Amino acid sequence: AKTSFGGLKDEDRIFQNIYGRHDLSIKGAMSRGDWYMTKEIIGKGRDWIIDQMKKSGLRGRGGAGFPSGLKWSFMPKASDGRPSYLVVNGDESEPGTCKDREIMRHEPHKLVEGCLMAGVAMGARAGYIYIRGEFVQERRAVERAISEAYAKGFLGKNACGSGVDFDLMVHYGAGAYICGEETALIESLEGKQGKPRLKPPFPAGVGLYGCPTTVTNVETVAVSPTILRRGPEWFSSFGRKNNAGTKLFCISGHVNRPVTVEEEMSIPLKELIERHAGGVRGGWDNLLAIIPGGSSVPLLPKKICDGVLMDFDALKEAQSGLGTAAVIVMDKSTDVIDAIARLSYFYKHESCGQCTPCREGTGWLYDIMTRMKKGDARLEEIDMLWEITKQIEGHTICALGDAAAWPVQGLIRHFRGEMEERIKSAGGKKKLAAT
């Protein structure tokens, strides 16, 4: 077994046109290997595709990391009276995350063929893609690919000459981050406000229009045809055990060369940033903190980052998470309290307001953080702030409340001394007026 991970070859990258350098039409995609042997893969069977996706070790690229093969197997196998639906999540409103924009803009035929593969794998008759409403050109490119796939008979009745029927449609939102949640996405797709449902029931039991439904990420869907053609053993040869495969990483912030780049999983952060991105602005010793997985996961300081692998089972043990693998880098000129305060403002702004702890407490967290930025607080209010985050987390309907508690927990845990110094030194400009 390999011990050192990283330095993925160009011949092993799935997304060979992530930069849009080549021809974007269906002839360019078909010459680059897309829509190849699709009828033969569909003719293998539903159970075969489920088994092949199970053996690959591919986990959910949406941010939770559930195994995709077992998730797709939750759909029913027989007929009861209701059709089944595939829904593909292309919201991508996570701060820092811009991989699905590239997949939808530059490689949409991989997404469309993966939609066909997943719909056949789950018995689904129709499919919907929920693209972000801010992504207008990405929606246009996806619709061009869908029209091209209809014109060659890849989608529809007798799809790819296989006998299975599958239709694909495009829906788009109107600017809500909460519509990335599964049941909230179903509720917005049904023609309502994007407010999540309580589980149970589960979307594979009762989903869109009361019918069995699976919601999957764009990057999860798009890598499936390459996995089926090149094999599950090829995909699982990358990364650690239970952490298989390749991953798109977005590196943003105080970095010399910000980049969306594909790489093997279980690569170190320092390797992933120094190569492929030109390193930290001002050297690695100018690093202050790094959020490794978007915005919903806690930050890490410089000591944890030097050594930790960008992996599901490695960031979690470092009291963080991989999430969407969106990397945000701050340097020593950053006011980290101000950065997490703007994150608190984001989570206040994006709360859907359905349940009591999220709706009332995200504004409270923002007010406390705004006072902490100026140092206009008390030292025990830090422990109060931790208690309030523990009151929100685990107590709400959906996981946006946990995603609102988690950055403040990481800020307190790794920079409590900075917060205490900000409180203490503010009295050098506030207690000179009291006397």
């Binding site: 009276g81 009745k157 239709d167 029931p201 009762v206």
Partner: protein, 164 residues
């Protein structure tokens, strides 16, 4: 196992009500009013034995017959007598001696205890059984998952799909 309000002084109240010799005390009809020493026309009035229903303004159930074994909930009530206004101030005047004594002080665990008190005191009584709450929900919205079921508008027809 047995645990029915087994952490308070009410354990020491349920027994001391079943002490032998004192748990079988009984009197004849109207006899307790003769020895009560109150005027005998008081027992010509009518009483009602009933358990009051839950208030519509609130959702709690503590003052109902649901917690009948835990808390005394049965009441004795009397009909109103004349009231008028005071000419000098406007305050409400009355000549009723039983104006608040049944609603403030007389509470019973069961219906039969209040009946026994009325029988030994000589009050003629009418008993009103409270209306029983129903717990089973409607067929629509029986569970939370029926909010999102196929009963909203039927199974969706797949006739507007591309390729029909």
């Amino acid at each position: 196992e047995f645990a029915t309000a087994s952490a308070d002084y009410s354990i020491a109240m349920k027994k001391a009500a079943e002490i032998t010799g004192a748990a079988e005390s009984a009197m004849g009809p109207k006899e307790g009013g003769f020895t009560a020493g109150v005027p005998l026309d008081t027992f010509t009035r009518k009483a009602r034995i009933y358990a009051p229903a839950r208030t519509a303004s609130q959702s709690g159930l503590a003052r109902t017959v649901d917690f009948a074994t835990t808390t005394p909930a049965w009441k004795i009530e009397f009909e109103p007598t004349a009231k008028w206004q005071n000419p000098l101030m406007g305050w409400t005047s009355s000549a009723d001696p039983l104006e608040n004594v049944g609603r403030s002080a007389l509470v019973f665990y069961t219906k039969e205890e209040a009946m026994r008190f009325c029988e030994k005191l000589g009050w003629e009584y009418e008993v009103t059984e409270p209306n029983k709450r129903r717990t089973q929900r409607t067929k629509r919205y029986m569970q939370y998952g029926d909010n999102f079921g196929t009963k909203r508008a039927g199974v969706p027809d797949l006739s507007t799909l591309p390729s029909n």
